[PDB]
Design a protein around this ligand. Sequence first.
Ligand SMILES: CC(C)(COP(=O)(O)OP(=O)(O)OC[C@H]1O[C@@H](n2cnc3c(N)ncnc32)[C@H](O)[C@@H]1OP(=O)(O)O)[C@@H](O)C(=O)NCCC(=O)NCCSC(=O)C1=CCCC=C1
Ligand SMILES: CC(C)(COP(=O)(O)OP(=O)(O)OC[C@H]1O[C@@H](n2cnc3c(N)ncnc32)[C@H](O)[C@@H]1OP(=O)(O)O)[C@@H](O)C(=O)NCCC(=O)NCCSC(=O)C1=CCCC=C1
Ligand SMILES: Nc1nc2c(c(=O)[nH]1)N[C@H]1C(S)=C(S)[C@@H](COP(=O)(O)O)O[C@H]1N2
Ligand SMILES: Nc1nc2c(c(=O)[nH]1)N[C@H]1C(S)=C(S)[C@@H](COP(=O)(O)O)O[C@H]1N2
Ligand SMILES: Nc1nc2c(c(=O)[nH]1)N[C@H]1C(S)=C(S)[C@@H](COP(=O)(O)O)O[C@H]1N2
Ligand SMILES: Nc1nc2c(c(=O)[nH]1)N[C@H]1C(S)=C(S)[C@@H](COP(=O)(O)O)O[C@H]1N2
Ligand code: SF4
Ligand code: SF4
Ligand SMILES: [Mg+2]
Ligand SMILES: [Mg+2]
Ligand SMILES: [W+6]
Ligand SMILES: [W+6]
Lengths: 652, 653
Amino acid sequence: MRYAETGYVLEVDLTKGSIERVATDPRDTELYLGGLGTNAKILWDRVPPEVEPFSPENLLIFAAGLLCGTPATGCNRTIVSTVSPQTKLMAFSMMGGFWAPELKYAGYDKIIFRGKSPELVYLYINNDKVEIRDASHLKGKGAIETAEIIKKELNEPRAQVAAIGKAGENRVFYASIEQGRSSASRGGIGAVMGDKGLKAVVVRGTKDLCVAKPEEYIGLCNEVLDYIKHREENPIPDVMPILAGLGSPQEMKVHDEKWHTENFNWGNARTRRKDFWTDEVSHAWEKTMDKARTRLISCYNCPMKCGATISMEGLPTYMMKCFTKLTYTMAAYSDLDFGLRIAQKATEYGLDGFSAPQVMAFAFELLEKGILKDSDFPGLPEGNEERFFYLLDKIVNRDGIGDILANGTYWAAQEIGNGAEDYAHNNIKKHEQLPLKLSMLNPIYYLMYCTGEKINITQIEGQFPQAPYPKLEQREAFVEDWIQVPDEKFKKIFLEWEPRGEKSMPNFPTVDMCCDIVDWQEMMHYIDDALGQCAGLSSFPLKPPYHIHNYPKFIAAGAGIEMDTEKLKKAAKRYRTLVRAFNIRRGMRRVDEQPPANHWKNRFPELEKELLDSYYKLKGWNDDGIPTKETLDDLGLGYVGDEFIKRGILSA
Amino acid sequence: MRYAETGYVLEVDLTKGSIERVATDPRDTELYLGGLGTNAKILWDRVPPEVEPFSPENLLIFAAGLLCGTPATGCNRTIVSTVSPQTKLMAFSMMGGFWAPELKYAGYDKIIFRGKSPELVYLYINNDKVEIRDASHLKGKGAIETAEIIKKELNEPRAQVAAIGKAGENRVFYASIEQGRSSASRGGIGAVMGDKGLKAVVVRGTKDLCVAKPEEYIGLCNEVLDYIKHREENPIPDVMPILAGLGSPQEMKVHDEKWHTENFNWGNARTRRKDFWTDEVSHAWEKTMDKARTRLISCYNCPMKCGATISMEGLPTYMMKCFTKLTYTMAAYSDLDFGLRIAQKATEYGLDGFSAPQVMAFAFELLEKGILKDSDFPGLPEGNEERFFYLLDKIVNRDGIGDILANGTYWAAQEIGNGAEDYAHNNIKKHEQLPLKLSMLNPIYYLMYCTGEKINITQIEGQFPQAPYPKLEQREAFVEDWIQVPDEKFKKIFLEWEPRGEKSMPNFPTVDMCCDIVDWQEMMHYIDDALGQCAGLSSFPLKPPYHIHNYPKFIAAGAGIEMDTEKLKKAAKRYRTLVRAFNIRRGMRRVDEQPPANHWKNRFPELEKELLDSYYKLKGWNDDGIPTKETLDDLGLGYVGDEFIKRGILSAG
Ligand SMILES: CC(C)(COP(=O)(O)OP(=O)(O)OC[C@H]1O[C@@H](n2cnc3c(N)ncnc32)[C@H](O)[C@@H]1OP(=O)(O)O)[C@@H](O)C(=O)NCCC(=O)NCCSC(=O)C1=CCCC=C1
Ligand SMILES: CC(C)(COP(=O)(O)OP(=O)(O)OC[C@H]1O[C@@H](n2cnc3c(N)ncnc32)[C@H](O)[C@@H]1OP(=O)(O)O)[C@@H](O)C(=O)NCCC(=O)NCCSC(=O)C1=CCCC=C1
Ligand SMILES: Nc1nc2c(c(=O)[nH]1)N[C@H]1C(S)=C(S)[C@@H](COP(=O)(O)O)O[C@H]1N2
Ligand SMILES: Nc1nc2c(c(=O)[nH]1)N[C@H]1C(S)=C(S)[C@@H](COP(=O)(O)O)O[C@H]1N2
Ligand SMILES: Nc1nc2c(c(=O)[nH]1)N[C@H]1C(S)=C(S)[C@@H](COP(=O)(O)O)O[C@H]1N2
Ligand SMILES: Nc1nc2c(c(=O)[nH]1)N[C@H]1C(S)=C(S)[C@@H](COP(=O)(O)O)O[C@H]1N2
Ligand code: SF4
Ligand code: SF4
Ligand SMILES: [Mg+2]
Ligand SMILES: [Mg+2]
Ligand SMILES: [W+6]
Ligand SMILES: [W+6]
């Protein structure tokens, strides 16, 4: 008897229209846990480097986390995985809401899509009943719009739908997948879905989902709820609002956006506006938000209600959370009202709200520098906001210039030329970063930009504070009840750490301290992404209810496998290394692991080399960023080491 | 977590040399239990009827039964499965000894071979280590001899080896697979294995094998050991020694062979010798066997020591059990000394001891009657004994007439022509039956010859007595402690049944009594062949320690899944019916289900129709032997019914 997981996946061949339920190997659960980890095993095993993103043999995997469908608060994440058309590397992407738990109640842990459907279709799951339906009547329709039409069609009001918009259908490289108040946003996972002729995945489930140790498990869940209450009455002192509590960045609740608007860059990650947040702006954006925000709403089985239904006059309602509230606004040098309006269109089209704003601001920089012509934007309006709505439509239809921009700043620049590459200045591994151009090198963030397989800073940070406290007693207070640390050395680091002087960055924390910090922050994310646990109650906020000390108890009581703190750390390291190996096999080397040239105004080449060198060694990789044969063997990834040798990636 | 079964199989593609471990689906254990049952599910959805026996897409499966590797006494059977090159139907074949347990301790429930290796290879398993080795130095070597060379070669003296001899390498249609004192003998599984270029499968295993409810399970084991003790202090009264106790027919222990020699047909199932067993012959054969039998030896975890190492002067030692002690002897009209000598060669070649002798005896009949002439046997020696050794070599090398004879009597007859057919008079579905030509219709045995999917009367019979007692007092004594019957109906039947008179065959037992009796006897074999339990302690002998009432307890406490008598009965029904449907998909029909014209001297067309008409209904089949859509939906085999409807085998409505 399997627990927590269902022990079954669906294999779907969209070319042949075949559908097969397949029992999983319980050993893969012990080694790789579930979610992202087991996705990485499937991709390693079945997608060799000769496979292109828009090749039939590319896989699109929808995974429900190990503990999704259990009573674990906030444990509801879907992990979508494939090879990215933008980065040509592995792309995994997380989605909240209600879809993953529904897949579990239907009896499945994953759906694995291979092939391509000639006709636009959608997959319909209802417990044991699985079938492929014609979706041509859904062509071009928005992601939310599509879900609503389908639930009508099928008479399944309680079904969960993950869908693409027109942007997905047209294989826009940063096209997302949307489900109610949730989104698998980055990496172009939506483009692959469109490429396979897959319009939506509709699931309804009414079966039981069992846990192994019933009372132990519910006990841990209450422990978490108690901690969520306590923690809510005790926000982290002296820290800006949107990051003092639990949850995803609480930007739908908090009106104050001084930190973001004054420290992040506007336009094409170009312009700092140090004194932007006037009283006049604060009042105007609060008015817009109060009027537009219908309700704060939660994902499945969670009280934090991070997201919000948003209603702009004369526009369909949509749902939003976190930073997409500002990225369109800031990239366009506009106001919050504009942001919320265009975000509505872009959500329905199904576009990544991080990359898309920067692509458009990239385009207008080129148009202004004359590198692009005005004849490349035919019928172009000349009001600034109108031009953003205009280009959004060119991109989503791959129309003329939109066809090039639809490929992202890296490829658009390379395809354009005339020094367009100079303006694609905010990429790592061909993927747009957050619009941050700070002054002083940050040793911890340096390592995170360089090595993160999600290639997104907000999805590798969290557990260690972003800044030190000025006063010693503030730090003593903070580390006092910091139970989430793996080792008390993390307390001592934060005690010593100071904003200014001989114990400040970039020289302190030390290189070894920075390696431990990045390793821990990263580890927690990978655990979240295998369990399906929302980072909002785990790896993202300071002092979460889930941590390295009770996670082993959740896994043991939930899935009925042996698990403790050490074994879990090792598990996390195992599929973190496997994801690494997957990208190594696709061509990634040390050379690729470098932040934008202009990401800090003060650079320290020798400190940075020493940082990356020491981090690689901590990981157990060689100086080209490849996992060694020794590390692979000890992790039980011998088959990886063997293939590395056979492929010349490692020499014996 | 999985119990009793390991939960994994090895997928092996011999064309490409790919080796892959795959986890199984615990729902398949629920529906089909293990062993033969799950073999059948595998064959059903991976081997469609367009596939030939020697097609690279044919599958060759080695399965350890569900309870092999546990402490259950005598639970050690490998189940081999493939499509038969001789019958073109499913072939399953059981081999005892030590191989299945070892596979379980290595960590696997089955090995599934597909494709064909261009070069001769063997597969070597040692726990998680699995590799394909070149076997070319082994070409032509005997099965046991191959085993010994491999173990020394690998430095694996405790490994278990299943191997083919020359006969298998040459695709003899009745080639066997041999393993110590054990053999997967019938249906030609050895030819498929040679055809795939696979010379042996070596397995060493040293991992734990777990049960769900430790205490309950060992409790049940102790109960069987107890029953085995008292059952051996109480042989069934007034019955032939070889079949009065537990185990496979105890022919290596019992020297009294009066029963066989006087009631079975010598030669090509031809000659009865009503008074063969003289005092002079008994002393002669007793002397032979005393000298030749080195030791009585057992399969894994069993006290019955049914088999024997046999050592003939100047020959390599081999092992033997059951009726091959006599088949060569009788086919050649010879003595036991000859039987044991030629059976040594035949065993090393890897040949089925039932078919081979009849094939040779049939050849010499045709020679006598001039259908074959001396030109067909260049260099044929003069002596009778010497001729048999000559023809054995011809057949194994598919040399000359041997090439035709290596196909079995049914195909050889058709190819030889000129009246050869009339002499291939002991086949059912192109498969040689035991040399039995009785005088009066036995209605119970009529049913078992017709429908049995193993197509061998000795692997479907057992639980009901073959004959009645002369006195009622005897009948009453027997049924008093007969706890094994599924219902009490069976005790009453045996009480009424008498040798001569009103309550005697073929009219008693009635047509309905015969069907219940044949259902039960068959079901127990299918349970044994799923669990890997030796029939010698179960479906074969009267009053066994395993039976329908405690088997569910073993499955529950061993495998950790719900089971009770009714669910087990229905499970056995489920995969027995699946095997039926597989043979239907490959074209079998009621027409194929006749015994030989001459199997009994006194026949009854009317009763025989009614017998088979009734039995079909009880199984839930058509009047053409096909499982109806309703009975298929009931057994959770809707998907079978569907395919049958798609292919026009069952009409919709
Ligand atoms: C962003 C941030 C405000 C930057 O802080 P700061 O402004 O202090 O940093 P700064 O620009 O480097 O330097 C300022 C001045 O100090 C000076 N100086 C430096 N070192 C000095 C020394 N040792 N001694 C003396 N002076 C030293 C410098 O030279 C400079 O002076 P200048 O006028 O002469 O040029 C802070 O939160 C941080 O550190 N973030 C971490 C990294 C990050 O990107 N985090 C956010 C990730 S996204 C996220 O989390 C999200 C959340 C929600 C939704 C979406 C995303
Ligand atoms: C063969 C057997 C030993 C005795 O048989 P019998 O000779 O007694 O029966 P018979 O030959 O039919 O008839 C004799 C005479 O009586 C007459 N007559 C008959 N009924 C009559 C009546 N009611 N009333 C009046 N008269 C009746 C007949 O007409 C005839 O008279 P006739 O002078 O005119 O010709 C008994 O076990 C049996 O029949 N088994 C059947 C199943 C079978 O095949 N078993 C073995 C399966 S393999 C196995 O188990 C192995 C084990 C170990 C290793 C390998 C394999
Ligand atoms: N396991 C996991 N949970 C996560 C994240 C993640 O990367 N991994 N991202 C967080 C952030 S920063 C946001 S804005 C939301 C995004 O929710 P969505 O995927 O439904 O749009 O998920 C949060 N939960
Ligand atoms: N369409 C869409 N894109 C989006 C978002 C969203 O909510 N909707 N969230 C943004 C935020 S805040 C984050 S943290 C990332 C989430 O990354 P992921 O969905 O690939 O896991 O997407 C960004 N892009
Ligand atoms: N499960 C099962 N056990 C069985 C049998 C069988 O058909 N199924 N055949 C019995 C008979 S009649 C004999 S002679 C021996 C033969 O053992 P072997 O296959 O190792 O040569 O197995 C006995 N045990
Ligand atoms: N080579 C060989 N053939 C043999 C035997 C044997 O032990 N060795 N056993 C005979 C007996 S007594 C039986 S019951 C069957 C067993 O059939 P199976 O091994 O195909 O299951 O084969 C017969 N042919
Ligand atoms: S913390 Fe917020 S984003 Fe995470 S599950 Fe709860 S409501 Fe959803
Ligand atoms: S009864 Fe005989 S053939 Fe069966 S397992 Fe025991 S020793 Fe082997
Ligand atoms: Mg997401
Ligand atoms: Mg056998
Ligand atoms: W976010
Ligand atoms: W036998």
